DNA sequence: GCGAAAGACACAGATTTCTCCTTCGCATATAGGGATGCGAAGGAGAAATCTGTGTCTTTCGCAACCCTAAACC
């Protein structure tokens, strides 16, 4: 809570900065992201969080060695979430089939209990990231098996 | 933010070796005497290499933590 306190100044500083320039600005902890669509206007705002860090919280700094640039034709994620070129949240496809998987194995009961709690928290995020994951499994494998599986334990 | 135990950076100075610098001693092609040219050791005084000391950089298994699942810092 003390850090949210302390870096007041530089948010509030940094933001109206942003917002003359149709850019939009947001920060996690110690991570602070950039998004536009106008081309080749990103290219200056390193200059000027190192001016507004040095005028408003004197002592911090910089590390220069992860900084990133992406666009619309590589992987694009925000702190853990995929963001579709439609323009949607995802998980990734790497958990889908995994999770698939886990159910189909459990379809057999070669599933063991510590795997069970596991997927099944894995599947409560997973639904609330999406919102539509439960109704895909059910129409699959069907109500009854993911009735019996939530029920488990 | 930083234990102990070894390196990097910057500044002195010391020393053996090499190289420049007198002093005279042959020499030899011109019949002895004189002259231009070069070889031999002492005695310098210069220069590359080595060694010395003092100021910081990294980052520990650091009395003193909870026991249900997933993600982020």
Same mark, same amino acid.
């Given at each position: 809570?003390?850090?949210?306190? #302390?870096?007041? $100044?530089? =948010?509030?500083?940094?933001? =109206?900065?942003? *917002?003359?320039?149709?850019?939009?600005?947001?920060? !996690?902890? $110690? $991570?602070?992201?950039?998004?536009?669509?106008?081309? $080749?206007?990103?290219?200056?705002?390193?200059? #000027? #969080?190192?001016?507004?860090?040095?005028?408003?919280?004197?002592?911090?700094?910089?590390?220069?060695? /992860?900084?990133?640039?992406?666009?619309?034709?590589?992987?694009?994620?925000?702190?853990?979430? %995929?963001?579709?070129?439609? +323009?949607?949240?995802?998980? +990734? *496809? =790497? *958990?889908? *089939?995994? &999770?698939?998987?886990?159910?189909?194995? !459990?379809?057999? +009961? &070669?599933?063991?209990?510590?795997?069970?709690?596991? %997927? /099944?928290?894995?599947?409560?995020?997973?639904?609330?990231?999406?919102? =539509?994951? &439960?109704?895909?499994?059910?129409? /699959? !494998? +069907?109500?009854?098996?993911?009735?019996?599986?939530?029920?488990?334990?």
């Amino acid at each position: 809570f003390i850090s949210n306190f #302390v870096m007041y $100044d530089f =948010d509030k500083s940094l933001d =109206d900065w942003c *917002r003359n320039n149709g850019i939009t600005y947001s920060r !996690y902890a $110690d $991570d602070i992201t950039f998004s536009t669509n106008i081309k $080749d206007i990103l290219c200056r705002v390193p200059k #000027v #969080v190192k001016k507004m860090l040095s005028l408003h919280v004197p002592g911090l700094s910089i590390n220069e060695s /992860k900084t990133i640039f992406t666009s619309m034709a590589h992987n694009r994620h925000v702190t853990g979430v %995929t963001l579709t070129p439609q +323009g949607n949240l995802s998980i +990734g *496809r =790497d *958990r889908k *089939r995994m &999770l698939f998987a886990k159910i189909h194995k !459990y379809s057999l +009961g &070669l599933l063991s209990s510590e795997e069970i709690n596991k %997927t /099944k928290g894995m599947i409560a995020f997973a639904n609330y990231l999406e919102g =539509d994951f &439960l109704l895909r499994l059910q129409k /699959k !494998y +069907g109500c009854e098996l993911i009735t019996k599986f939530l029920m488990e334990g």
